[PDB]
């Protein structure tokens with residue numbers, strides 16, 4: 408388990424990557 | 433809970449994203 | 458130890474960096 | 483505390499940011 412802040416940051420990071428890929432495609 | 437280093441990195445990462453968005457807007 | 462989500466995010470982040478470097482080289 | 487992999491990723495992430503800033507300056 409991780410600090411809730413770190414979990415939040417990790418989710419944002421993944422969603423950032425997904426949105427970027429979808430934008431490029 | 434997380435290593436303090438990881439908490440620090442996550443905060444920096446979020447603030448990086450926010451500043452980028454504000455810059456673009 | 459970390460949340461599995463955070464471990465996943467960290468792996469993706471590293472692989473993102475590696476792919477970027479290989480692309481540039 | 484965090485998974486060693488996550489600590490590694492966080493260090494790389496910070497160093498990435500620092501190098502980028504120094505490059506721009």
Ligand SMILES: [Ca+2]
Nearest residue numbers: 408433458483
């Ligand atoms: Ca932990």
Ligand SMILES: [Ca+2]
Nearest residue numbers: 410411412433
């Ligand atoms: Ca806390």
Ligand SMILES: [Ca+2]
Nearest residue numbers: 435436437483
């Ligand atoms: Ca430590």
Ligand SMILES: [Ca+2]
Nearest residue numbers: 408460461462
């Ligand atoms: Ca969980």
Ligand SMILES: [Ca+2]
Nearest residue numbers: 458485486487
């Ligand atoms: Ca482990």
Ligand SMILES: [Cl-]
Nearest residue numbers: 409434459484
């Ligand atoms: Cl963690």
